[PDB]
């Protein structure tokens, strides 16, 4: 069959944000016909390149009902945990992914590049060690979204 859902855009919101900041994403997408099962949303924050083990499943939403038509919905996620994040990997750029599945099949995934800096001109010449998450700035690479789509079964 054809993908029964068609995501038209996201919006990054709150963008240039404190690290501790929650994620903020207003979804829109369109449904061919009213869908009989679940879909479930999902941000997950790559914490390094070293292993999918650091990888932060943020939060996850899960609409029961599907009716057709054109949608709109704010997605809200908790910052990662900066404890999980390699100190090598928590200063410069990591990705964020927004995920959606039916029937347990993911079909799309929205990938941004997320730049965390500091602040301080003194933080910057001279980083610490551990990373000072309190003086990191998170800014996401909104213009250049990175989205790859799956064939599933959508029947």
Same mark, same amino acid.
């Given at each position: 069959?054809?993908?029964?859902?068609?995501?038209?855009?996201?919006?990054?919101?709150?963008?240039?944000?404190?690290?501790?900041?929650?994620?903020?994403?207003?979804?829109?997408?369109?449904?061919?016909?009213?869908?009989?099962?679940?879909?479930?949303?999902?941000? =997950?924050? !790559? #914490?390094?390149?070293?292993?999918? *083990? @650091?990888?932060?499943?943020?939060?996850?939403?899960?609409?029961?009902?599907? %009716?057709?038509?054109?949608?709109?919905?704010?997605?809200?996620?908790?910052?990662?945990?900066?404890?999980?994040?390699?100190?090598?990997?928590?200063?410069?750029?990591?990705?964020?992914?927004?995920?959606?599945?039916?029937?347990?099949?993911?079909? =799309?995934? !929205? #990938?941004?590049?997320?730049?965390? *800096? @500091?602040?301080?001109?003194?933080?910057?010449?001279?980083?610490?060690?551990? %990373?000072?998450?309190?003086?990191?700035?998170?800014?996401?690479?909104?213009?250049?979204?990175?989205?790859?789509?799956?064939?599933?079964?959508?029947?």
């Amino acid at each position: 069959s054809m993908a029964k859902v068609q995501v038209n855009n996201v919006v990054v919101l709150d963008n240039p944000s404190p690290f501790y900041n929650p994620f903020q994403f207003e979804i829109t997408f369109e449904c061919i016909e009213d869908l009989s099962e679940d879909l479930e949303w999902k941000i =997950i924050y !790559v #914490g390094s390149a070293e292993s999918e *083990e @650091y990888d932060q499943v943020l939060d996850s939403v899960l609409v029961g009902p599907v %009716p057709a038509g054109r949608h709109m919905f704010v997605f809200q996620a908790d910052a990662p945990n900066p404890g999980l994040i390699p100190d090598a990997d928590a200063v410069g750029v990591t990705v964020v992914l927004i995920t959606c599945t039916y029937r347990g099949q993911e079909f =799309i995934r !929205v #990938g941004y590049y997320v730049n965390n *800096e @500091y602040t301080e001109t003194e933080l910057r010449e001279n980083p610490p060690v551990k %990373p000072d998450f309190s003086k990191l700035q998170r800014n996401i690479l909104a213009s250049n979204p990175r989205v790859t789509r799956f064939h599933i079964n959508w029947e």
